[model samples]
Every structure is written in structure tokens, then in C-alpha cells.
Target: VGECVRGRCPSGMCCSQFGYCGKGPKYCGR
Candidate 1:
């Protein structure tokens, strides 16, 4: 999961400042 984010976040949206991206109750397997 971490690796995926590291590789896919891009320079614009990689952190909380840009917006979160990960598995959550709202998007758990997506």
C-alpha cells in the first residue's frame, strides 16, 4: 500500500496537503 502511494502519488498530490489516498471504510478494496 505504501509502495503504491509512493509510486503513484505524483508531485502534486502525494500528501495530506494535496488530498489523502488509501484504503478506508468508504473505499476499502478499491
Candidate 2:
């Protein structure tokens, strides 16, 4: 569980449109 700051996620995790870090294709994929 993590929140994106300055529109970035700390590797491995994807930055969500809602402004958070998450895994899986839904988040990681474009």
C-alpha cells in the first residue's frame, strides 16, 4: 500500500490515476 508523490511510484509498483501505488496489469499497464 503506497501513495504516489510528484506522480511517481518507487519501482515495481504502478502509479494509479487516483494517485497511489498498485500492482497488476490494471495499474502497471498503460
Candidate 3:
């Protein structure tokens, strides 16, 4: 899932602070 409502991700994906589920700098670095 690219977006998160419950702030959860599917393993490798990370729950972004802006309420999104993703990886790389767009999600993890910022």
C-alpha cells in the first residue's frame, strides 16, 4: 500500500510521517 490510514506498512515499506507507506528518501529520509 502506498498510503496508510492506520500508519502501517507491508514489511519493506515504511510508514511515512506524512501519512504514507513507501520507501527511499521520499518516505524515510524526510
Candidate 4:
């Protein structure tokens, strides 16, 4: 599972403010 919490993201993906796993500008804050 690829989920991010507390600024902790895996699989080279980014964690969004909404607590999701992804990349790009959409997931670069919070």
C-alpha cells in the first residue's frame, strides 16, 4: 500500500495534505 502520513511518503511518491500517495504539484504540501 502507498500511503503517506506525517510527511512520510514511500515509493518515491509525494504525500499530499489530504494524506494520499502521488506525485507532481498536487502532492507537495501538508
Please name the candidate that would achieve the greatest TM-score relative to the true structure: 3
Whichever of 3 and 4 has more TM-score, that candidate is 3
List TM-scores for all candidates, in order: 0.19, 0.45, 0.50, 0.42
| Alpha carbon lDDT of each predicted model | 0.39, 0.68, 0.73, 0.67
User: Candidate 1's residue-wise lDDT over 1-30, tens digit each?
Assistant: 233464354543333332454444332333
State how far residue 29 of model 4 sits from its true place (Å).
4.1
Question: How high is the lDDT of residue 30 in model 1?
Answer: 30
Model 4 TM-score on a 0 to 1 scale: 0.42
Write the residue-wise lDDT of candidate 2 on 1-30 in tens digits. 466775776666777766676776666665
Compared with the true structure, the alpha-carbon lDDT of candidate 1 equals 0.39
lDDT of 3 by residue, 1-30 (tens): 457858877777777778787866678766
Candidate 3 regions with alpha-carbon error over 4 angstroms: none
- Lowest-lDDT window of 10 residues in candidate 2? 21-30
Error of 2 at 9 (Å): 0.7
Which TM-score value belongs to model 2?
0.45
> On a 0 to 1 TM-score scale, where does candidate 3 land against the true structure?
0.50
Q: Where is the poorest 10-residue window by lDDT in model 3?
A: 1-10
For model 4, what is the C-alpha lDDT against the true structure?
A: 0.67
* Candidate No. with top lDDT: 3
Cα deviation of 29, candidate 3, in Å:
2.5
